From a paper:
By contrast, the integral membrane protein [name] was identified as an inhibitor of FtsZ polymerization and its absence results in the inappropriate formation of multiple FtsZ rings, not only at mid-cell but also at the cell poles. [name] comprises a single, N-terminal trans-membrane (TM) spanning helix followed by an ~60-kDa cytoplasmic domain15, which sequence analysis suggests forms an α-helical coiled-coil. The BsEzrA22–562 and the shorter SaEzrA24–214 rods comprise multiple copies of the same ~100 amino acid, triple helical bundle; BsEzrA22–562 contains five such repeats and SaEzrA24–214 contains just two. Although many proteins are known to comprise bundles of antiparallel α-helices, [name] is, to the best of our knowledge, the only bacterial protein that is formed from serial spectrin-like repeats.
The crystal structure of [name] [name] lacking the N-terminal 21 residue TM helix (that is, BsEzrA22–562) was solved by selenomethionine single wavelength anomalous dispersion (SAD) to a resolution of 3.95 Å. However, through the use of highly redundant data, the experimentally phased electron density maps of BsEzrA22–562 enabled the building of 96% of the 540 amino acids in the structure. The only regions that could not be built were six residues at the N-terminus and a loop between Ser177 and Asn190, which the sequence predicted to be disordered. Overall, the BsEzrA22–562 monomer is a curved rod, forming a complete semicircle with a diameter of 120 Å. Groups of three α-helices pack together along its length, except at the C-terminus where there is a four-helix bundle. The formation of a semicircle confers the potential of the C-terminal four-helix bundle to interact with the membrane at the same time that the N-terminus of [name] is embedded in it through its N-terminal TM helix; this can be modelled trivially by manually extending the N-terminal α-helix of repeat 1. An anti-parallel dimer is observed in the BsEzrA22–562 crystal lattice as a result of crystallographic symmetry. The dimerization of BsEzrA22–562 in the crystal buries some 3,300 Å2 of surface area (~9% of the total) in an extensive, molecule-long interface. The principal axes of adjacent repeats in BsEzrA22–562 intersect with angles of 37, 38, 33 and 53°, resulting in the pronounced overall bend. However, [name] is the first spectrin-like repeat-containing structure in which there is a pronounced enough bend between a sufficient number of repeats to form a complete semicircle.
Residue numbers in the entry: 24 to 176, 191 to 559
The structure:
């Protein structure tokens, strides 16, 4: 039922709003009028309102709801129709209102922009007034520009203005940058070409044919880039690409400069790598070390033996080799054609070649000097081994059973048979430390590993003696077992007495391995 009221509402609304806006066509915003674009809408506004004076009385006709007051089903079927119609009209109205609130906008706005546009064309006449470099295209541009501005004198005109903005932007985007642009194709293009060719002209005191291929070619690339830049600018193309080309060129140039400074470096490095050949004679003191190698005649004659007199001569071989590499390097260097830079890789090796050999001859200096000390610590070791052997030899008393019956005439017949070797050592004149060291590796762990076992045997004998010394003859089955130990020990067997005192631990307290072993450890 209330739908009827809503129907009145969206009728009063549309009618009053349309009355107002149609009333607001001649009595408002009437200022400005183009006799072309306006006469289009001066008909569109008519027919658009001619619609609503036909499509609203259709709604008036369709007020059958007044009669259809008996049903509620046929109601909405002839109601939503109408409401959607009203929506269809008022959606076609606000479209118009937006149309006009643009035409009145797209005039009054652009009417305030032509001021700035003319203001800019006043500052482009001036900026080309005083100019003759590159002022052939500028004339054409200014000309067409002012032709356009002369043409603008509605919406089409707005568009033309909006064109002229961008056009102006391009005009001073030109007039600003182009000054410096040509200014490099006159004093900064040959300004660098001259500096580089005269560069080579100077670098004719430090340059080779090896670089007569990858050197003079980059100028053949540059001399292209320049003409490419020119063909860019002088043709309708603009700062874009060309301003990049200048960068590319600059990169090329300074790359070349770096390449030159690197050979200045290679030239300067030699002056610190060929006074290293001054030390190449300071290490030619072979005949000063081979005189130090004439104290073989007085002592340590193993210098004259292998693995010692050798190696040094091999370092004389190495010194000959590097000595030849030097002459080859200088020979290659001192040519009628100038020197260059590929030499650096050929000397970095040589610095190492001396760095090593020097340390080698140093090592052999040390080796020679050490021998005089080697036959001292050796004398210490032997003079000690004698003491050890003595004391253990005397320790081999008191133990009523002759120790290691098999290993007695074995590890003691190495006491005499590895001292007569030392007789041969410190009696030799000149002696040799190899003959000494050999009969010392054969002296180590053959004196000790014969004293350890012996001391363990003495310990064992004293122990067992003090064990049976607590032999308890008062027992009947322990005594007769104890007798089976004496008869076993007085032979020549080291296990015969092992299970011996194990019996003496299986009839005596748990502290049997501590009964005697403690008293002994006192």
């Amino acid at each position: 039922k209330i739908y009827a009221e809503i129907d009145r509402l969206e009728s009063w609304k549309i009618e009053i709003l349309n009355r107002s806006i149609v009333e607001e066509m001649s009595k408002i915003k009437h200022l400005k009028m183009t006799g072309q674009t306006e006469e289009f809408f001066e008909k569109w506004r008519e027919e658009w309102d001619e619609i609503v004076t036909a499509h609203m009385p259709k709604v008036e006709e369709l007020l059958y709801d007044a009669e259809e007051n008996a049903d509620k089903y046929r109601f909405k079927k002839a109601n939503q129709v109408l409401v959607h119609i009203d929506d269809l009209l008022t959606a076609a109205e606000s479209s118009i209102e937006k149309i006009l609130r643009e035409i009145s906008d797209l005039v009054t706005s652009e009417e305030k922009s032509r001021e700035e546009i003319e203001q800019v064309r006043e500052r482009y006449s001036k900026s080309r007034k005083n100019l003759l470099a590159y002022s052939h295209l500028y004339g054409e541009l200014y000309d067409s520009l002012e032709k356009d501005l002369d043409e603008i004198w509605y919406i089409t005109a707005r568009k033309v203005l909006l064109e002229q903005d961008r056009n102006l932007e391009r005009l001073q985007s030109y007039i600003d940058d182009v000054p410096k642009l040509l200014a490099d194709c006159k004093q900064t293009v040959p300004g660098q070409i001259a500096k580089l060719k005269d560069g080579y002209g100077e670098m004719k005191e430090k340059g080779y044919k090896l670089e007569h291929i990858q050197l003079d070619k980059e100028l053949e690339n540059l001399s292209n880039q320049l003409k490419r830049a020119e063909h860019v600018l002088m043709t309708e193309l603009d700062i874009d690409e060309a301003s990049a080309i200048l960068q590319l060129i600059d990169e090329n140039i300074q790359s070349v400069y770096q390449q030159l400074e690197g050979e200045v470096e290679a030239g300067q490095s030699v002056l610190s790598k060929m006074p290293e050949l001054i030390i190449a004679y300071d290490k030619l003191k072979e005949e000063k070390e081979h005189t130090k190698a004439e104290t073989e005649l007085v002592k340590e004659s193993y210098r004259l033996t292998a693995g010692e007199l050798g190696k040094q001569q091999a370092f004389e071989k190495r010194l000959d080799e590097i000595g030849k590499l030097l002459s080859s390097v200088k020979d290659k260097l001192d040519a009628e054609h100038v020197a260059y830079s590929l030499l650096v890789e050929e000397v970095a090796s040589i610095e190492k070649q001396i760095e090593e050999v020097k340390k080698e001859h140093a090592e052999y200096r040390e080796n020679l000097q050490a021998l005089r000390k080697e036959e001292l610590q050796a004398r210490e070791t032997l003079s000690n081994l004698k003491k050890t052997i003595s004391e253990t030899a005397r320790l081999l008393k008191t133990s009523n059973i002759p120790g290691i019956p098999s290993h007695i005439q074995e590890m003691l017949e190495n006491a005499h048979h590895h001292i007569q070797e030392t007789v041969n050592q410190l009696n030799e004149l000149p002696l040799n430390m190899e003959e000494a060291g050999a009969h010392l590796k054969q002296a180590e762990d053959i004196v000790n590993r014969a004293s350890r076992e012996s001391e363990e045997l003495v310990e064992q004998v004293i122990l067992i003696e003090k064990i049976i010394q607590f032999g308890n003859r008062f027992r009947s089955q322990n005594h007769i077992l104890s007798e089976q130990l004496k008869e076993a020990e007085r032979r020549f067997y080291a296990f015969d007495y092992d299970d011996s005192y194990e019996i003496a631990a299986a009839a005596v307290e748990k502290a049997a391995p501590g009964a005697v072993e403690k008293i002994k450890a006192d």
